[PDB]
Symmetry: D3
Subunit: 139 residues, 6 copies
């Protein structure tokens, strides 16, 4: 079944939003089939955000993303990738609608609480980057 | 700070209670320093419960906890072991006070949603069982 | 399973507490097997409280419960009668523990939001009073 | 005053969402003037969904709608029909905005948690189908 | 940093929504730097709604706004004025999206729960009208 | 009715708990008759705690309460002083029952989120200290 990748970023964790975010996914009827708290290495950060590497905000981005623990997770359901990205809302929380996670919880565009894969191909890449294969459980 | 061990049991996971349980801890000021979803081997359940081997329905206790994915976690905070034990409440959810996780959520002693270490020495044993040291995160 | 009887009183209805009360039961794993909104006739209130006829302010007790629409329901689950009685709490909401429905919501003994059967024999009597057998649903 | 019909469908009930949905209506300032849990007969199901009878999903639709208890209710307020349909969100939960009931709680298009009348004329028909006249209370 | 003015109107207060509304702001990451419950004089009401004074609903508007206590507050954050007005939703709660405050809590256009400055210039004027300068705290 | 005094402490404010605390009071049927955010002078803290002057770490108690903005309020309702004291719970949040504000939220005795008057004579003293009579509102 369709799967997507989510990460609750260091601001989300630091501000005590792990449970609220997870509850929104659960209530939506999505299955968590992998999850863990981790500390992302600078290498893994640069690899993950490779696309932004020539941007003037790149090191600030990697300092933020590596500045404390995150929660990484894999979520399974009908239309998972698309549905979780509507749930999460526009990248810039100032433009994200109320009812979305970024709309209800974010203010800055950089520290925007959470990440969700933007496409099925990004989900495969993102899952493989953050999880060993055995960290995936089935239920 | 003190650390303690918590496990959200297969029933807690299956009933969609992971976020609600976690928000209770976050709202309490507790810090998640390690967390993952996993599937506990019969072998590992048997070790966790080794003191129950010669008691009634030992193999049922192990069935309950190996029957689906659990969320294992480590929580840090002032008085954690005792605070967490009070928040989870009595083993039997009918006797657990309202306001506890087992009072508010649990069905019966077997389907009681969650476990938490009962002593600091239990916590040390239970954390070593479930987590390599590298899966712990300082924040 | 055990069944018990609950009534959300006119104050509970008027103050917009029906969902919150019901979510507490659902989160507890309780099954609603019958439910309706109704307006209790003085005659029927008098029967429900017949054991209070010779006590002080009998007619005030009946006023409280006939003064608006109530939600009547039947809940099924392990230990229901006792679990439900503990979740509703002490008759007097000032003495009801925080975490109970009456502790968290009730104003005074008359305006105490909710009733629940106090014994399995009370439950049987109170269910027969309020519901024909056809309004019960097996799920 | 304006009235509309709502039904929480068997998935909504089975998943323990009755209280959350009712609370959203209460908080919105709408009055519940009738409500009950019922089991919908196959006859009543076919009558209600008559419009879809030549569609290849028709019997699946009626099997689902009759597969467990629902909650039927009548809701009263300024613009009730239109307001409750915005609250409920697009039929296909994948297209329903976050903050709506279907957006926060549904995934499938068939099992989409809840139903609300789509027009004032549909409300009259739907109310008359599901409720006897005496099941309507005023407050 | 950017600041905006909010008032929870007498309907919001009377209906017990102060905490829910404040929590939405807190969760959003906005700072409350002034707040208080007050009773707005008819003079202050007319001054504040001066723009509507030749409208046939003007005295009804001032009777409502002065009919019980309000909560006035000042909120600070990145894009505060714009962000709080998206949060609050369209003036007419019937057109306000679910997830907004007016969308989740209002029905009438006059009694629409809450007010937020519509522009930075309106915020300065509104702050100065309702707060003495010393009622502003910094943190 | 009885009135009592509550203060949300700097930690409660800083941790974003003002709404959650207030909703607990509103859901209980308590009426806020005065409220403001303020910064307490050392002088005024010293008066509030004057009975603690000759006890250990007096100056630490005053540090905790002058270290940021607090929300001061007055609450009115049947049994308010006692009901509010039970809802806040034991001074020490580790001993406070789950379901109380200090049980559910407090870190330790110093960082215990909130204060409430312990007697009607304390309430009268504490209300006069914190509020001129004009800041009280009849509703």
């Amino acid at each position: 079944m369709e799967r997507t990748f989510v990460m609750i970023k260091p601001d989300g964790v630091q501000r005590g939003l792990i449970g609220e975010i997870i509850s929104r996914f659960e209530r939506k009827g999505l299955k968590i089939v992998a999850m863990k708290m981790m500390r992302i290495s600078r290498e893994m950060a640069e690899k993950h955000y490779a696309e932004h590497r020539e941007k003037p905000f790149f090191s600030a981005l990697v300092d933020y993303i590596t500045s404390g623990p995150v929660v990484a997770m894999v979520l399974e359901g009908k239309n998972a990738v698309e549905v979780v990205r509507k749930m999460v809302g526009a990248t810039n929380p100032k433009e994200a609608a109320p009812g979305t996670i970024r709309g209800d919880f974010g203010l800055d565009v950089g520290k925007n609480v959470i990440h969700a894969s933007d496409s099925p191909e990004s989900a495969e890449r993102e899952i493989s980057l953050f999880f060993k294969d055995e960290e995936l459980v089935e239920w």
